[PDB]
Design a binder for these strands. Sequence first.
RNA 1: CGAUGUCGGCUCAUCACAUCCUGGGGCUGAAGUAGGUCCCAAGGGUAUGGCUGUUCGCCAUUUAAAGUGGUACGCGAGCUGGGUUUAGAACGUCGUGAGACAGUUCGGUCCCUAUCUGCCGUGGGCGCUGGAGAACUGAGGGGGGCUGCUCCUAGUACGAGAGGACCGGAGUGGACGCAUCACUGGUGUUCGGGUUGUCAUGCCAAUGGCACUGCCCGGUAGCUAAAUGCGGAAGAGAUAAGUGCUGAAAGCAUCUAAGCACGAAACUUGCCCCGAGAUGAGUUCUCCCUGACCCUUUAAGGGUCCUGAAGGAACGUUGAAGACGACGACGUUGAUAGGCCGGGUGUGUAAGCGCAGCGAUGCGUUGAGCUAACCGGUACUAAUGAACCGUGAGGCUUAACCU
RNA 2: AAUUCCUUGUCGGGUAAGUUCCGACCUGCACGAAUGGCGUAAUGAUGGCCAGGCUGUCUCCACCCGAGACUCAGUGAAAU
RNA 3: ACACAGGUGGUCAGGUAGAGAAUACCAAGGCGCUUGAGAGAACUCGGGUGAAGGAACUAGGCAAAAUGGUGCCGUAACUUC
Lengths: 114, 209, 120, 122, 56
Amino acid sequence: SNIIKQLEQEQMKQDVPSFRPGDTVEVKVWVVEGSKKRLQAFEGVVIAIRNRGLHSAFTVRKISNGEGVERVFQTHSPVVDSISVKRRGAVRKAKLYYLRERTGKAARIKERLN
Amino acid sequence: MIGLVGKKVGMTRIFTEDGVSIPVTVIEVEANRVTQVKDLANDGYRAIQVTTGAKKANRVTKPEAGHFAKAGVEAGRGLWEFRLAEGEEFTVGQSISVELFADVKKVDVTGTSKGKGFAGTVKRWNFRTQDATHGNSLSHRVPGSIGQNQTPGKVFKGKKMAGQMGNERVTVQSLDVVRVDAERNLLLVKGAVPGATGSDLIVKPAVKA
Amino acid sequence: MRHRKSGRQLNRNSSHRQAMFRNMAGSLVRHEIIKTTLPKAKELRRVVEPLITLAKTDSVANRRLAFARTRDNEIVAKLFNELGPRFASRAGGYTRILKCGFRAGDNAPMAYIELVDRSE
Amino acid sequence: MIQEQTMLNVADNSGARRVMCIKVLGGSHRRYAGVGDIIKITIKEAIPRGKVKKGDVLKAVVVRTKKGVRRPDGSVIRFDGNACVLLNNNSEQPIGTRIFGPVTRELRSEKFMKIISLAPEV
Amino acid sequence: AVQQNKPTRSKRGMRRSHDALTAVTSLSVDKTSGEKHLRHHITADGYYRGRKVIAK
RNA sequence: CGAUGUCGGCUCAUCACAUCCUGGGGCUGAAGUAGGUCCCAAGGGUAUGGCUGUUCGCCAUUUAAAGUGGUACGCGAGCUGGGUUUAGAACGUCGUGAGACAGUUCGGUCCCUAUCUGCCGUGGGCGCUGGAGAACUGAGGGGGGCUGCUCCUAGUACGAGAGGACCGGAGUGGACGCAUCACUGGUGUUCGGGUUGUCAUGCCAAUGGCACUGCCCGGUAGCUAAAUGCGGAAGAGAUAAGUGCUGAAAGCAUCUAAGCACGAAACUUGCCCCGAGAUGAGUUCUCCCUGACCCUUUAAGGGUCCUGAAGGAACGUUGAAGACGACGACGUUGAUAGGCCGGGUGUGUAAGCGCAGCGAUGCGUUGAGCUAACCGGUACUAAUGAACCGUGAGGCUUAACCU
RNA sequence: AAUUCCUUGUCGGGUAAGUUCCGACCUGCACGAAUGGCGUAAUGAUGGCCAGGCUGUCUCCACCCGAGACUCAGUGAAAU
RNA sequence: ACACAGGUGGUCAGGUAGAGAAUACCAAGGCGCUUGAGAGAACUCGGGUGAAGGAACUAGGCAAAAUGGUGCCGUAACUUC
């Protein structure tokens, strides 16, 4: 049997960005609220793993206070209208959990200068 | 009115334009082979032996082999005899596809629970333990006071104590149909289903509806 | 209780669950036949066949296979010379266990493991 | 979770930072409170511009949580701190003139004509 | 300590009606050496499953 | 008195209603919303904090409810031992003083190898009339229900106003108990990263130990609920308390006698799990056996010689099955387990070599090397060949068909 | 009050709510001078109370490791 | 009363660290335990790791858990100084 793999493939979108931990993003959603179908826009930072296929969480933080203001955007969700990639940081690690106990001025996703 | 058997292939989330992701279970329902149709009403009742899969021929004995021989060369395991009342079905041996649910909104699924062994009172009856703070010793995973002091002389039968959990029959009473495609053997349902390889997953239309 | 866990526990100290067999693999590369209890022969066969599949490949700034422990100096004349090249054209299974029952009357089942390329 | 004896901050404008939950309200044997839910509260802190004394007992509506929300649209949204709006013990409704923060989208449709009219973003 | 005389020999003599035995159940004879052995076990003659395993 | 543990609380509730809430039926000296009250159904259900060791008491806050009454003023081979109760004495009282006071206080004794009666699970067994298996049935047993909230009746009625409802309707949280691993989090002593101290390998380089898995950061499968997910319904039937129609015993009258229609959450039917020890042993299908003589105060038992089906157990590689038994998958007629070949995922770019820098360190070789639990293939190690147990068409009687 | 039953003392603060705490009242059933009267700094392997701190004490424990409980072999008690 | 998880005065003393005669790895030297073969379940007990809430636990912060080291800045009332 293969029908489950074709079912996830018709629910996934025909192109989406391949972002990773240490990336910044700008996202637009229509919030599924009511008759106006009104748009909401946001810009933030990714330190959570994407990860792969239909069930990507796409967890984004603002990284500007000692509390991250976390939101789960879901890459393949039909409530999303645009997903845009901005910049990438000088990190090499993918876990990055130490940044959850720092404020935004101590979580600038590294610069290194090698 | 009857039911079908088909095998689980996985669980996923379909995603919907209401924002909710709707967790769904995928079942592949190959046409149920039909080993015998009993429309002749012997002893005052009608039935159908819907049949799915077959058992390895080194573990099929002659008392079972002759019980599938009159409808094919393959035999054993799930014969599945269902009774027929207030409904006519075609009189001759003919297999039944999953299109039986293509005009059904709600279903139920019955199978066999996972093995949980020994259990004990706490893991069988989901029972409140005794607190180990401020003393108490030698027993904390017991129900306490199994009868009402001195005048019972006895314990009552079938009470919420002891026993072993799992490896038994279990029903999930309500699931929503999402997609049916009999050319692909496909059944797609909103929800989750009990047990793994011990579970037969007998799926039925809602008899309340 | 067990639902994915299966690995044989055997010994009280955590490292002794491997050391008992690391130490006895040195005796097996020496004598090519060993007498020990059936669960100890099964745990002796564990990981040492993948160590012969590691003795199959060309190594660089590393001679550490079987030499990092047990202080034997005959292994460095067997390895890459005949231990490896005698077992690389067989496709797996480098030991035969010769499974037997109780040795005489106690509850100890016996095994007579051999390194499979032996002659008589 | 927001349960009995849980500490929150005041979102009614120029309010105190420590106020404590004592009853979840509404019945059906329900436990805990979510965002947009009404609770019984006690005032653990007083401030010079504050409208209420320490030890007073009132009603409040929850407007922000660290745990956040995940069920109305099936996806998770989390916030900074644990916050609530205080109500008058005689006449009910908010006691200041404004409420702080953008709040939940479900709170913009809630049973409170004086809370859905204020300037929060969402 | 608490006991009503002894456990009756009627109940003790009923204790063997349910299995508690640990002993090998049957032995068989090899078709290459005529030697007596256990099932799925090598002979004292070095023969098993129709083949010669070792020289003895 | 040859033995009868004490107070409250916890912990466990149990069993009721002279009914706390919910369902249903009538009133108020009840305009509505309120306040006050009589009573059928025992079917569904019936609080947390403060002060105190507290029953009691006052005091903060809920719920549709926190009410009345029993159970060693309910639970010690239950928990707590805070209170009451000894063994030193501190303060007050009576007395010269021992001793006395329904006085206050610091500290102060709660320990168990399951014999029988009970109950639960798991094997085994005898019963069932030749032997065997698979599915079915239902005499019998348990589960469940009540409350809120939005929308409708309706801003109707009643009410100068202030306010502000019935009874039949539609939808849906949550409680309760269980089921999933898609994900979402925690864990994860078969994995990995960083690192403090030390040991050996001659040394150094580089590895492998030990110090709680040395620690610190992390983690797959699996486990786990916070993760997400679901139902006890409707309809009909009968019908208590209750509302009535027609109406007799009885020229008149009556809610009853005959003839009838209504009348509840529940009940009965209904949903689901279990169930032939139901010796009342049920219904149905499927497999198999075609030898011959003999004995008895011989319609039932017992031998000899031949012969051994269907089926069972033993042997065995493994487990989303398991204390042990027992049981699914699977056995060379083979990918069940390990090993191999290739890839996947995890780990994150090693060593050696070449270089940048005074060096710590950094770069290229290098998406390196390594690899828990997966997955496209593959018989290298293991997953018999026989023997054992089970027989030979099966009693007595009648009814029905043909010889 | 290490003394007071009367009381749930009374009044103030503390607490959501303070028979416990401290500061006061005098109407002390029964304080008072080396059987010491009343005060007191530093101090406590302390009787009580307040705030601050952190926490599996609690909401509510969940996973995970280790032995015994087990299946065998060798041995192998007592009260009752 | 035992070939007993117990007790027993003084003497010595090397490496790495470390304040050290602590502790942890090693030396000189000693020992692997007078039961073996396993299997890895309720339940009790001794340990390892932890999300959001938080003394509400309980008569009682009892117990547990953080705080803890070696330098520097800084540091109230009161006092028998």
